[PDB]
């Protein structure tokens with residue numbers, strides 16, 4: 243109560259300002275966070291909160307052309323978010339579930355979105371089909387009540403690690419690993435790309451990276 247403390251919240255939901263993945267001494271900083279909102283029968287429902295993490299100095303070193311751009315200029319530029327999705331650096335997304343769902347509901351819905359988005363880009367082949375089956379089957383085994391957490395980890399752009407946490411803590415190891423460049427990138431693109439499910443997360447990340455680069 244006597245020294246400065248930093249708190250980050252997304253509509254009241256706390257996010258850690260930094261996360262150090264188990265097995266690593268490298269700290270990932272929260273770049274930005276937002277919500278997945280869905281308008282259902284005119285009701286604006288917040289169903290998850292999404293936080294995006296990376297090593298600040300490292301990711302800045304891979305985004306140098308954007309230096310000096312304001313958050314507004316970045317948020318309006320699809321090229322910026324494509325650079326961010328492709329940057330060859332470690333990334334972590336933390337999802338806090340707001341509206342409880344079955345794992346099979348989550349996995350099925352997101353898998354179909356990635357299937358469709360990859361198909362739209364002509365990046366859907368048998369390899370991606372198989373990887374998406376692995377993704378879906380992982381979630382079929384899980385329950386996602388309010389307050390549960392999904393961790394998506396990209397130790398490199400082509401590798402996706404997944405865990406589900408009941409208490410927000412990171413497990414000592416990933417529960418599932420999906421090795422497919424297109425699926426790994428497409429999942430990150432669900433959050434940061436065009437027709438993103440979370441414009442708020444994108445805007446927040448634009449604010450964070452704009453500040454970081456300055």
Ligand SMILES: O=C1C[C@@H](c2ccc(O)cc2)Oc2cc(O)cc(O)c21
Pocket residue numbers: 280289290339340341342343348351352353354355356
């Ligand atoms: O209703 C949905 C939609 C679902 C979803 C995921 C991916 C996709 O492509 C479409 C929908 O995400 C959610 C996540 C929740 O915690 C609660 C929810 O009710 C939902």
